[PDB]
CSV table of C-alpha atoms in Angstrom, one decimal:
chain,number,residue,atom,x,y,z
B,1,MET,CA,33.2,34.7,157.2
B,2,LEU,CA,34.6,37.7,154.8
B,3,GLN,CA,33.7,35.5,151.5
B,4,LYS,CA,30.2,34.8,153.1
B,5,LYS,CA,29.6,38.5,153.5
B,6,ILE,CA,30.7,39.3,149.9
B,7,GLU,CA,28.1,36.5,149.1
B,8,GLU,CA,25.2,38.0,151.0
B,9,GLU,CA,25.5,41.4,149.5
B,10,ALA,CA,26.7,40.3,146.1
B,11,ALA,CA,23.9,37.5,145.7
B,12,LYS,CA,21.1,39.7,146.2
B,13,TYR,CA,21.5,41.8,142.9
B,14,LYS,CA,18.3,43.6,143.3
B,15,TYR,CA,20.5,45.7,146.1
B,16,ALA,CA,22.5,47.1,143.3
B,17,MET,CA,24.2,49.8,145.2
B,18,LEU,CA,25.0,48.0,148.0
B,19,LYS,CA,26.8,45.3,145.9
B,20,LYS,CA,28.3,48.0,143.7
B,21,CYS,CA,29.5,49.3,147.1
B,22,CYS,CA,31.3,45.7,147.2
B,23,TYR,CA,32.7,46.5,144.0
B,24,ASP,CA,33.8,50.0,144.5
B,25,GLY,CA,36.2,47.9,147.2
B,26,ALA,CA,36.9,45.4,144.8
B,27,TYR,CA,38.5,48.0,142.2
B,28,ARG,CA,41.8,47.5,144.0
B,29,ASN,CA,44.0,49.9,142.0
B,30,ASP,CA,44.6,52.6,144.7
B,31,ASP,CA,46.7,50.4,146.9
B,32,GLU,CA,46.5,53.2,149.7
B,33,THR,CA,44.1,52.9,152.9
B,34,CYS,CA,40.6,51.5,151.2
B,35,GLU,CA,38.9,52.4,154.5
B,36,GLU,CA,39.9,55.9,154.6
B,37,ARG,CA,38.2,56.2,151.1
B,38,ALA,CA,35.1,54.3,152.6
B,39,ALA,CA,34.9,56.7,155.8
B,40,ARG,CA,34.1,59.3,152.5
B,41,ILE,CA,32.2,56.3,150.9
B,42,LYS,CA,29.4,57.1,153.7
B,43,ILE,CA,26.3,55.8,151.8
B,44,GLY,CA,25.2,53.1,154.6
B,45,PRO,CA,26.1,50.6,157.1
B,46,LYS,CA,25.4,47.5,154.6
B,47,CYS,CA,27.6,49.6,152.2
B,48,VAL,CA,30.8,50.0,154.3
B,49,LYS,CA,30.3,46.4,155.3
B,50,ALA,CA,29.9,45.0,151.4
B,51,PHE,CA,33.1,47.6,150.9
B,52,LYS,CA,35.2,46.4,153.5
B,53,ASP,CA,35.1,42.6,152.9
B,54,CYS,CA,35.3,43.0,149.2
B,55,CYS,CA,38.5,45.5,149.9
B,56,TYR,CA,40.0,42.8,152.2
B,57,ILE,CA,39.6,39.8,149.1
B,58,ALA,CA,40.8,42.4,146.8
B,59,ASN,CA,43.8,43.5,148.6
B,60,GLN,CA,45.1,40.1,149.3
B,61,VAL,CA,44.9,39.3,145.6
B,62,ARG,CA,46.5,42.2,144.5
B,63,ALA,CA,49.3,41.0,147.3
B,64,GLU,CA,49.6,38.0,144.9
B,65,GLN,CA,48.9,39.8,141.6
């Protein structure tokens, strides 16, 4: 489900800001609480969704590397 939601936002690359909300979740160099920062990233419902699923995969690969 999580990877499928990344794919449904980051497939439709015409929706540039919303897949870049994904990629705002994917720059996991903060290591603290990304959902408090995406309480501040309030740009749209799809933006928080892209951000949250990308942050979860990014956090779980950061827990590995």
